[PDB]
Amino acid sequence: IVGGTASVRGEWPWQVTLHTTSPTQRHLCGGSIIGNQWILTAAHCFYGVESPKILRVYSGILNQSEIKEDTSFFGVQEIIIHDQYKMAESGYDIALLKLETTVGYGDSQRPICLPSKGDRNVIYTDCWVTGWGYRKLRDKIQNTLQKAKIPLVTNEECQKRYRGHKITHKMICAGYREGGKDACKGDSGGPLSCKHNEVWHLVGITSWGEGCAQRERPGVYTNVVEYVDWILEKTQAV
Numbered sequence: 001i002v003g004g005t006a007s008v009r010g011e012w013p014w015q016v017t018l019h020t021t022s023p024t025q026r027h028l029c030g031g032s033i034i035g036n037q038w039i040l041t042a043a044h045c046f047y048g049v050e051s052p053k054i055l056r057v058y059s060g061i062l063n064q065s066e067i068k069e070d071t072s073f074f075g076v077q078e079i080i081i082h083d084q085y086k087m088a089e090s091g092y093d094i095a096l097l098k099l100e101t102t103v104g105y106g107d108s109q110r111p112i113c114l115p116s117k118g119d120r121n122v123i124y125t126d127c128w129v130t131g132w133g134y135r136k137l138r139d140k141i142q143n144t145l146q147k148a149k150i151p152l153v154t155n156e157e158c159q160k161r162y163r164g165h166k167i168t169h170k171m172i173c174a175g176y177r178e179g180g181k182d183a184c185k186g187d188s189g190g191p192l193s194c195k196h197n198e199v200w201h202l203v204g205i206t207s208w209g210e211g212c213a214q215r216e217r218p219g220v221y222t223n224v225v226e227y228v229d230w231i232l233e234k235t236q237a238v
């Protein structure tokens with residue numbers, strides 16, 4: 001996260017850190033708990049990942065230093081990537097992880113609500129992007145989970161900022177015209193969380209941008225409300 005501040009423990013209890021163990025163990029991406037065996041994340045995180053066996057999901061984490069060989073994690077039974085996904089910049093950047101065991105909810109780990117299809121017309125004014133990513137393009141993963149408050153940008157304005165891309169209504173953009181606060185490398189797959197009527201909703205999934213926090217280059221997120229039915233198809237299958 002660029003221009004962020006440290007989170008306090010339990011502030012974002014749906015945030016997870018997804019690690020890969022191959023060739024060595026390290027943080028790969030963020031994700032969000034959406035159900036008791038389900039993480040919602042970005043499809044691009046799995047480029048070159050040939051099996052769910054190399055993944056570990058850690059929940060209830062503030063600091064990456066909490067993770068050692070003896071730290072509990074959730075294994076991944078299945079990686080579900082949207083069938084129309086080709087690359088982040090074209091959209092459909094969404095994936096589900098089905099966990100091998102169930103998450104026991106509590107004050108350190110619990111799900112975030114999905115947006116309501118009836119809330120496609122709400123104006124969210126209290127949105128935050130979180131993660132352990134870099135603070136600038138050439139940096140390193142941060143120990144403490146960071147947070148930054150960022151305003152949503154209309155599709156028309158976002159399209160003006162990315163003249164050479166097709167910014168669809170399945171994407172949602174966020175950032176200041178002047179730049180300075182954004183997601184960065186290592187934040188992808190995590191949430192863009194917005195508080196509406198005292199309830200947090202998962203509005204976006206951190207996806208891509210041109211550089212980090214640049215003037216007139218908002219971050220581009222998967223627009224989760226446009227995928228609620230896809231999520232229910234995969235997670236509530238008969």
Ligand SMILES: COC(=O)Nc1ccc2c(c1)CCCCCCC[C@H](NC(=O)/C=C/c1cc(Cl)ccc1-n1cnnn1)c1nc-2c(Cl)[nH]1
Nearest residue numbers: 026027028045183184185186187188207208209211219220
């Ligand atoms: C010690 O552990 C580490 O160092 N781990 C570790 C360290 C870093 C990384 C990995 C692991 C995962 C790489 C492969 C999958 C993921 C590949 C893409 C991913 N992108 C993002 O996270 C965000 C992008 C992004 C998103 C928004 Cl909304 C706005 C601007 C953005 N940026 C544009 N340019 N930079 N940011 C990424 N993540 C990393 C890089 Cl390197 N790039």
